[PDB]
């Protein structure tokens with residue numbers, strides 16, 4: 001938002017800043033039935049027992065399906081892959 | 089002897105080196121989040137995957153070609169020192185001021 005001042009201008013900038021972060025365990029891909037699934041938008045996360053896929057700037061865990069993953073490859077070339085079931 | 093003197097800068101070279109090292113460590117262990125809020129950790133291959141995704145190339149291009157990209161980056165970094173040393177007039181802009 002702009003404002004005027006004697007011999008000048010003053011800007012009021014509005015910004016969004018993240019806060020209250022949390023630690024998680026992550027993997028680059030999910031192996032299932034001999035195929036590697038990558039996320040479309042978001043990262044893979046785990047609270048310790050189960051796996052989820054979430055967005056970047058907010059913690060909103062969702063069940064892993066085939067609607068938000070694309071396979072495009074095999075399960076012997078990616079480093080750090082962790083297998084888990086992928087529902088449908 | 090004629091009344092002309094040169095004053096020293098406020099920031100010594102050690103402080104500038106500390107600033108540069110802090111920036112490098114922050115951009116290596118956090119990505120770009122340390123410039124917009126709290127620093128959030130992330131593994132480096134994942135950060136490279138997201139930087140690849142930024143320019144329109146999917147993530148699976150990196151994860152299946154990690155070793156080749158790492159070797160190319162290492163060689164590109166290595167050639168820089170020899171390029172700087174061999175060229176005689178590399179740092180001309182900084183010398184012209186003095």
Ligand SMILES: *[C@@H]1O[C@H](CO)[C@@H](O[C@@H]2O[C@H](CO)[C@@H](O)[C@H](O)[C@H]2NC(C)=O)[C@H](O)[C@H]1NC(C)=O
Pocket residue numbers: 047048049050
């Ligand atoms: C990680 O998240 C999963 C999914 O929410 C948790 O599993 C649930 O835990 C609650 C708490 O007891 C149960 O009521 C649900 O029935 C569980 N879900 C299923 C599908 O069984 C899991 O507990 C979380 N991990 C930890 C350590 O809390």
Ligand SMILES: *[C@@H]1O[C@H](CO)[C@@H](O)[C@H](O)[C@H]1NC(C)=O
Pocket residue numbers: 021022023
């Ligand atoms: C995550 O864990 C590290 C070490 O285990 C710790 O230093 C850090 O504070 C943790 N993150 C948060 C948000 O507490």
Ligand SMILES: *[C@@H]1O[C@H](CO)[C@@H](O)[C@H](O)[C@H]1NC(C)=O
Pocket residue numbers: 082083
């Ligand atoms: C899933 O990963 C585990 C742990 O790395 C491994 O022992 C197992 O062989 C994998 N599953 C299959 C079907 O190969």
